[PDB]
Design a protein around this ligand. Structure first.
Ligand SMILES: Cn1c(O)c(C(=O)NCC(=O)O)c(=O)n(C)c1=O
Ligand SMILES: [Mn+2]
Length: 221
């Protein structure tokens, strides 16, 4: 669908009502699988980190490591389709501007490409932006074809604030996810027993980001 119809008829109302929004089949099989090929290419050539240190053993060779990451601008060689994903995200947000809460989005981070190795590691419950660092919207794109959470785990579990319930989101291929980055959406990644790829971008509210600068940019006189 065109960025605008999806943004105006589905994403905006869904975010303002629930603070979470799931869009399936965002780019199609062709583009999605190309992005998967680029991400897997980055992983195979060692562009990722060794992984988040989960359990630090007194013996170093026993240290267990979890999610691996790499920051992608989208202009790198062999990342053109990732850059196209980021451009499409940016189009959606552009068409949403002024309608997502009271936020005026004026920037974003680079793309955090994450790979859970499938060694039973996940990601602890957390809030993305708990201290007003300027990020208002989390946007995640998943790449895992034929994912069976009953078999592979890796579910994203969100605990919407005030609501006695949690929302389970499987990291499905060609799935796009939006949710408020602040304390409204604490969330965790449940242990993944299969390789789990995702691409996250965070969008900045102009006012919050502007006053985060003093919350921490100097000029010699
Ligand atoms: C700061 N940070 C996160 O907030 C992640 C996160 O919330 N992922 C949700 C999901 O993949 O469904 C994450 O995965 N990684 C690697 C990370 O570094
Ligand atoms: Mn998170």
């Amino acid at each position: 669908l065109p960025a605008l119809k999806l943004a105006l008829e589905y994403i905006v109302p869904c975010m303002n009502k629930h603070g979470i929004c799931v869009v399936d089949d965002f780019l199609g099989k062709e583009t999605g699988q190309q992005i998967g090929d680029e991400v897997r290419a980055l992983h195979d050539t060692g562009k990722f980190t060794d992984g988040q240190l989960v359990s630090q053993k007194s013996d170093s060779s026993k240290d267990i490591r979890g999610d691996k990451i790499t920051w992608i601008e989208g202009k790198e060689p062999g990342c053109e389709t990732i850059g196209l994903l980021m451009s499409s995200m940016d189009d959606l947000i552009r068409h949403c501007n002024g309608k997502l809460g009271s936020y005026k989005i004026n920037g974003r981070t680079k793309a955090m490409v994450a790979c859970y190795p499938g060694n039973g590691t996940g990601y602890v419950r957390h809030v993305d932006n708990p201290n007003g660092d300027g990020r208002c919207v989390t946007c995640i794109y998943y790449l895992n074809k034929d994912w069976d959470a009953k078999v592979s785990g890796g579910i994203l579990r969100i605990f919407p604030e005030g609501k006695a319930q949690f929302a389970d989101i499987e990291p499905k291929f060609d799935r796009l996810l939006f949710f408020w980055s602040d304390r409204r959406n604490p969330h965790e990644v449940q242990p993944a027993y299969a390789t789990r790829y995702a691409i996250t971008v965070w969008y900045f509210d102009a006012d919050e980001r502007a006053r985060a600068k003093v919350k921490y940019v100097r000029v010699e006189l």
